[PDB]
Design an enzyme around this catalytic site. Structure first.
Site, PDB file in Angstrom:
ATOM      1  CB  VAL D  58      -8.741  -5.219  -0.732  1.00 58.70           C
ATOM      2  CG1 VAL D  58      -7.760  -6.246  -0.604  1.00 58.70           C
ATOM      3  CG2 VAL D  58      -9.126  -5.060  -2.090  1.00 58.70           C
ATOM      4  CB  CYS D  59      -8.148  -3.212   4.340  1.00 56.76           C
ATOM      5  SG  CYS D  59      -6.966  -2.319   3.229  1.00 56.76           S
ATOM      6  CG  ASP D  60     -14.603  -4.659   5.192  1.00 55.51           C
ATOM      7  OD1 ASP D  60     -14.930  -6.142   5.378  1.00 55.51           O
ATOM      8  OD2 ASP D  60     -15.304  -3.944   5.626  1.00 55.51           O
ATOM      9  CB  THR D  63      -9.895  -7.492   8.670  1.00 55.50           C
ATOM     10  OG1 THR D  63      -9.030  -6.549   8.323  1.00 55.50           O
ATOM     11  CG2 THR D  63     -10.244  -7.551  10.017  1.00 55.50           C
TER      12      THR D  63
END
EC number: 1.11.1.24
Lengths: 166, 163, 163, 163
Positions: D58-60, D63
């Site tokens: 989710v963070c990938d 970003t």
């Protein structure tokens, strides 16, 4: 060669991607199985690998190379992988016609992840160069051949000997 | 420019081409790896059948049907996909046909990018049909909503015959 | 309790552990964020390889060599660092190796502080190797004098083989 | 003060910052371990994207989305997480991203404590977005209620473009 490392049908060809030499560790890769599932290096964790890389299993030389490595290499002992830019659909249909349901065929067509990581993209053609890499269970590259003229066969005995000797 | 494949969202990449536009040039490869462009068929109407892959059943049948049903005395029937040239070649040989033009966009996606039918996620061309008159005016277009469904054969064959 | 790192002095923080001491217990995270302690490996000899970050080249090679060269039939090879569990999970996937245990001390520095290997200025663990017998007596220790240098692999592997 | 991560209660630690407040300073680390502070971005508006770890899915995606969607001729897009700088650096290199700022808060939780986004039970930063104008007034903030959910990308992008 002096300008590019290899030829295909006698024409010079540039190899693109990271160079990998015997003694180096195997890079990761992400490829597709015949059903479009993602497959990576880790899926063969703990095994020695004979990785046979071909321009197209729909050509005669590549077809014979896939057959011979699969027939001659002990599959009780490790894993024989065939990797090309054929679409997963051509690989799947090739295994079905050949009536070979024991043979692993993986497609690098979408990202060329394998090709760029192992230094075997034939840039003018967007096909992978004919090549063989042998990996031990620690993913040390114990043997590499990139075939000089891509319509010639690889040295089968040297790669089989390297795979058996692990 | 929003379709699904197997129900999953797929974003289409490349230039949007609509009915009433003039069709762009492109470079693809024949079964022996020769370059072929739109101009190689100058002066002829075209039914351009685009498929994810002739090694699947829906694409195989779409290819055979348009080639069987469409007049080739009258115009040209092109089948374009991201299959390698070697697969299209073997596919013509398996079908037993010397009369079906198959062209490979695998190298550059020149065709897919110019016609707005690249399925970005899959690096395959979306199932679609464009009919071009002899002046390359796009008289008919369909991009199939769900890529594993058949295109509308009758409407496309009608647009082609009616030129 | 001082080393250098790229030639700069670094202060080690935590309890000094010597050969002949019994190794202290500690709590670290496995790649799925489950807690793991030293008691989870009870009854086996251990080679504990400590690295500043498996995302750097020396730490990567150290980690591969101790895992391939030590026998895993009658002992355990632990790699412990301040890398997040997510980097160690990605790292083991990337390398494709079988049966490589990596454990993260990122949350508490429970291991670093219990073994005297916290590089205080950096909040990374100092490059080090401890070999424990099956009763957790420390039979070998090295904290590498310059942290960017390799550890002595043969000395550590010989201590482990001798148990 | 309270959020969930995978449905379990997480407590946030640090100073509460609200829309209208001026932005606290911080010291974090760039990919080469140079210290970075608020002052390095003086004169610019900033979109600060905070993520538990660029090594999770989710963070990938968060970003990449902020980076491609926000104009970078207009202001600065920062990603801050508790990943080691070596993991951030590896992540930019393997994704082929020349032009993405990732900053590490792993050493001190300087950013996390000053902005009230430390997930206490995890020593990770809560998923969050702060938008700062050139006077470092916080004109927009979201702390995502369930930390595995995406932020509201559109609301953050509108606040950023509206400065």
């Amino acid at each position: 060669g002096s300008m590019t490392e290899i030829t295909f049908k006698g024409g010079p060809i540039h190899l693109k991607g990271q160079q990998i030499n015997e003694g180096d560790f195997a890079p990761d890769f992400t490829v597709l199985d015949n059903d479009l599932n993602q497959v990576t290096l880790a899926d063969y964790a703990g095994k020695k690998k004979l990785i046979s890389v071909v321009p197209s299993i729909d050509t005669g030389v590549c077809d014979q190379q896939t057959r011979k490595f699969n027939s001659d290499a002990s599959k009780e002992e490790g894993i024989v992988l065939t990797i090309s830019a054929d679409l997963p659909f051509a690989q799947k249909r090739w295994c079905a016609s050949a009536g070979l349901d024991n043979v692993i065929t993986l497609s690098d067509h979408r990202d060329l992840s394998f090709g760029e990581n192992y230094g075997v993209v034939m840039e003018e053609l967007r096909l992978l160069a004919r090549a063989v890499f042998v990996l031990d269970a620690d993913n040390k590259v114990v043997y590499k051949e990139i075939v000089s003229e891509g319509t010639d066969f690889p040295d089968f005995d040297a790669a089989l000997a390297a795979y058996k000797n692990i």
